[model samples]
Target: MLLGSHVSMSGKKMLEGSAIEAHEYGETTFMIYTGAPQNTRRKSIEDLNITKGHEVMEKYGLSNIVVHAPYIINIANTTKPETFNLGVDFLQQEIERTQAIGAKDIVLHPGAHVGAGVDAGINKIIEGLNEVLTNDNNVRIALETMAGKGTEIGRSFEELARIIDGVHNNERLSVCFDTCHTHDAGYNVKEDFDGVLNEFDKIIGVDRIKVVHVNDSKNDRGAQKDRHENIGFGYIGFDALNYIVHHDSFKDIPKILETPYVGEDKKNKKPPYKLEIEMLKQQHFDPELKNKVMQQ
Candidate 1:
């Protein structure tokens, strides 16, 4: 399985630090944010130590790494030019950084419309994407499927199809399918996995799904809440999620876990990727998995 979780790059070695985490997790693929998710502050690619990172990744056979565009870039905000421009400008910056890091795909969330109406918001998104995507870089922007939260544009397959179809430079476009988001958006993933894929194939084509976010939802299906629970502890269950990761259609895609951290005490929560990956590989749900993670 080309599987891994969202790892950190804020260590002393930056990219190398993230690669080390991937090696430790026994993952063939991994994902990271180029910088902090909530802000635009960034250092140069040279400062990120890409050379050292590539060596470490090569040493461990870690390939298929991807970067996540920060959540702050909302091109759908038509009310404020500054907000929309940040999305355009910052997204361009993210694409170049992804190229410098030697990764081809950068996962992105289609922003909320904020009462601008769907058509107007989609027009703005198309405009911004056209302005940003250029032939200079080989990076592909993979729009994430939303959980139908408020006025989010990528909530439905048709919405994503609209954006992709409208863009002129659409060859650089793709999708990031999130298990939690789709499940919350009223898709019966646990029971109708094949049917869901069939629908996605019919509307947007399954080949556009470049990456998969393997997460369980904290709420029931159709709840419209985007909460992510641990691997087997949530409503999505272990068996279904395990099947998706190992499925033939997504065998070459990177399966990233965005599950919540675990801990016994409130102030001492820690990342559970190491243990969760083990659980998925074992294909056996341990009721005491949280206990095991917290005690470590």
Candidate 2:
């Protein structure tokens, strides 16, 4: 079972810092934002220290690592030209950065349509993707499934398939299945795992699934809310999440945890990934897991 979480890439140490954090949590593969996820600030490729960072990853056997494009880049906005431009230009740079780090895939949100409506938004996304993708970079843009929150696109397999079919370089694109988002989007991940996979196969092809965001949903299925709870502690339940992580077809894919941090103290809230990975590794759900992560 290849497992990991969204490891930090803070401090200018870049991939070196990220790999060490993943190693600390017993991760085989992990994810990171190449730079700040909030804005476009980035260091030049020469300054990112990819070489020494890769060495650290090799030392810890961290392979098939992933990068998540900043949430700020939204290419589907038809009403706002600058936002769309930023999305296209920044995404291309992100692809280049992903390649420089030698990561296999970079997960991206399909972006919301906002007030432009779904079809027009999807059309715009196709145009943006075609503009950003090139043969120069081998990085795959792993479009993430969303929770249908607000005007978000890619909440359904059909929409995702449409975007892929419309792209000129479909081969360079893949999917990132998020448990919380999928469940909230009404796919019934907890009860209909096989059915969901079959539907994805029929619509988007199961092979397109390259990265799995292993999160649990705070809301019930079909809620369309994107709140993510810690492992074994949400509506999706421990058994269901465990099954999905070990599922036959998708287990080999890079599974990343984007669950909420624990600890009641807001000032010191810490990521629960360390103990969460342990729980998943043991395949035993500890109901007191949150309490254990809290305090004395």
Candidate 3:
């Protein structure tokens, strides 16, 4: 559990303020959505002031870093040619940006099919990815697991596996499992965390799991909607998270927080990152695991 948060990328502080937040949280790895959700438009990430960000990360001794792709990207929709093409461009640019910052992974949601058949949706995404990911060594794309909400394509391990398989550049692809998504899709990790890992490994290979979004669910198992909650605060419960962090298969990857922890008015209070990390540490695991997580 290399704890981190999905921090907002701020331009006001000239990228320096948010880096301090990462340092304050004791995060080794952290992520930022390049822009707000619902904006399908793209931008050159280079323009964002990151000189101070680099200085801050180096000063705080934080290592791992990642970029969460913008929310509006949806390759599955053939209807939106401009949006899809721009998405491909954004992905390629994001890969370059991630490498520039010394980050290893670029997290993305394998888009919704938007009425296209699931297989067709998966194929569209894979084909688009193959066109963009020509450089395998620089950055890895982590296709996120969706909560099976509506027509979301990457809901199950099998679906995700297919996306991995369809990509010509398999070496540059990986998975990012959101606990809430898995739980909402009805993956019973509570009784058998190993079993879930085994299933994923068998289909997509465990080596492809690049990151884990440690979130609890606001909905019941198999609900299909993604609603993140605090560690022990959600229905998935804290014990399940404990089981996941304790599992050996996840020892090597960065475990992040996508859970909601807004304070008081649930406006912009305590970011969920703090509570999630505290709960993860409270459960207590092997010293090595603890060190792997806490050293940020």
Candidate 4:
């Protein structure tokens, strides 16, 4: 698995090389927003300049990169067909952008059912995914699990499994598990990461697990709050993170940090990336586990 984090693409926030330069970083992956959050359209690929990213990745020998879809997307909102249509357009564009940038996966929320209820929302999600999949071939959509807050339909693994099963073509749908969301949703991932994996395998094959979002909950377990805090400092704490990093089931997926960088440098820049990475690396859970379980 590639150990990675989400970094800003704009200004000095472009931590790709800076973070690498600060540490002897290599063979690590990361994610970025293609544009501002909640915007319907992605900023031009030319704007982020992939040539530089390619060079950096080559120089550092990094791969397994990805991008997070804008937060504005809500595929289940068939309540407003026009709003849903706009989301489809935005998602299609996101798939195109991911392909253009050599990113293989894009993480997206499956959308809330709102007052429309679960069945209708699932159908709308299926419709939207099918429309986007038919339009593109390269980028795979990793439907993220949510905290079941309000009308959110993705709080349970069964719910996400239902959406995947509903897709007309299953090729486009993959799973992106967020630790904090699952923990906040009352899954107790801290002590049951492997058990959660077993349940996920039982519902939707574990092979569909492509990305992992590493976050710690700011709220207590079963709080249903999506708030993220720095690793070890949040509710999941260091032990949960250690167990996750050392788990054999997660050996192939890229683990990326979406946790908060609460501490700042004198320049007011957040510095929690390395802290998270180091925490993961410090896991003493058998080093032979990955070798025994994986081809690598």
Candidate 5:
């Protein structure tokens, strides 16, 4: 259970910056985008200081980090031909980029259908994945579980399974489960943690899960909202979250935080991610003591 957060890579040192930031947050594992995630703009591995980054990572005893694809990428939009093609191309580049940085997995949202409906969107997603993965890129594309927001796909384990089933090379595909999204999409993380995971094991098998977004939801269960709260402050308390961190089935899987960094006062301006990272590292639940500590 390696715990970390999404670190920034906006420095000239590129991956090296991400490594240093992760270390500053006391992280053993982290996630980063190759470049700006909103646009296709990027810097090749040859351009970034990857050699130096690897050195920093080694110094911190960090390995098996995760990379996330840009938010703008949508491989399931069948309404626009050019957008679909762009998604396919961008994803291919992302796969190459992930490999370039020595990362083994890249997490991606399965995308929305717009008005194309669930079945059609799943088909287009399969098509887009097959195109990008036709060749052996040596990287696993981990489809992230999304909140059932709008027309988003991959809300259900069954849907993720269907996408994998359609892919020509199944070995290259995997899953990145998000606690907040799964809770918002109606899975009972609070009381049915084992049951939900058992269902996931039954549908897609727990082995396919390569990453976990350890977040608490701002909204209640089945709200279809995607907002993320810090570990203990949201509906999913630290008790359940700790169970997830200590779950035997998830051992060795990377757990990354996508929660907000606001201070306990909620006005520190800068996010207290380092503190959050430390708290999660403790891996235990004491609501009174934990909440008091978080306030500092």
Candidate 6:
């Protein structure tokens, strides 16, 4: 698997810092935010260290990379006119920013419907995407699979398919399947990995799966919650995640870790991705060895 994790970039030298951080994890692929995910603040793309970051990636042999859109962007909520309009502009800028970084995919949370019905919300998201994306821009917008929390769209395979169908340019649309969300949303990834994937293929086609968010869930299957645990530390279990990492179906796609990064002390927070990256890259799956190494 082309494995990596979500990494932060220093504001001044965004790309180079991110590349260097990925190297620390022994990652072949990495994901990053262009700016604040919760706010509207953005620096001109030219002002960011785009060229230098490319040089760093070349130096480290890191080729496969993806960009994540800010969290505050919500095109699915059409009820609030101002919010909807702002989301359109925000997404447009996000697309531009992802292209500037030379990334191929932009993973987005498809957004919650709030009071809006699912159909209406899906239509709005489609409208917003059509308005933002163009043929000139080759960046694929990946709608992340979300836990069925608070009327969130893209929780089911059919829901994601509908959004892709409604869009004017379906070619620019794709899916980012989150293991935790899919498990919580009621697809058994532990024992029925093939069942869930076969369902996805039947409904949405597996060809559109651009990336996989390799997270173990804190909750049980069909729990409808979105909490993520560190690899091998959750109900999903390490062996199941191991199958995902080595599965032939997803062999070529980029597998990313969105697991917890907190250190042992509650106050001290540091990303615990280096070992997880190494373990997954190595494709180690022995339960006895896994338990011993994963807890450390």
**Candidate 2 local lDDT, 131-151, one digit each (tens):** 998656789999999999999
> What are the TM-scores, per candidate, against the unseen true structure?
0.98, 0.98, 0.88, 0.87, 0.94, 0.94
Off by over 4 Å in 6: 285-296
| lDDT tens digits, residue span 62-167, model 4 | 7788778887788899778887999888888888878877878899988988898998998899888888888747678998889878888889999888888878
- Candidate 1 per-residue lDDT over residues 1-296, each given as its tens digit: 78898888785699999999988877888999988877878888788889999999999999999899888888888898998998888889888888989987999887878999889888899999999996568899999999988888888888999999999989899999999999999898999999999999999999989999999999989888899999889999999998898888897899999999888678989788888898888988888888888877
- Return the clash pairs for model 6, or none: none
lDDT of each: 0.89, 0.90, 0.75, 0.76, 0.86, 0.85
- List ranges where model 1 is wrong by over 4 Å: none
Residue range 55-94, candidate 3, lDDT tens digits: 8878987657667887778877666788779889878877
Rank candidates by lDDT, best first.
Answer: 2, 1, 5, 6, 4, 3
For candidate 6, the 10 contiguous residues with the lowest summed lDDT are 285-294
Give Cα distance to truth, residue 143, candidate 3, Å: 0.5
RMSD of 1: 1.0
List the candidate 5 regions with Cα displacement exceeding 4 Å.
263-268, 284-296
Model 4 residue-pair collision total? 0
Residue pairs clashing, model 2? none
Off by over 4 Å in 4: 11-27, 264-269, 284-296
Number of the top-ranking candidate, with lDDT as the measure: 2
CA shift at 290, candidate 6, in angstroms? 12
Candidate 3 has an lDDT of: 0.75
In Å, residue 3's CA in model 1 sits off its true spot by 0.4
lDDT minimum window of 10 residues, candidate 5: 285-294
- List residue ranges in candidate 2 displaced over 4 A: none
- Across residues 94-151, which tens digit of lDDT does each residue of candidate 6 receive? 7888888988899998988898789889999998898888647899999999889878
Clashes of each: 0, 0, 0, 0, 0, 0
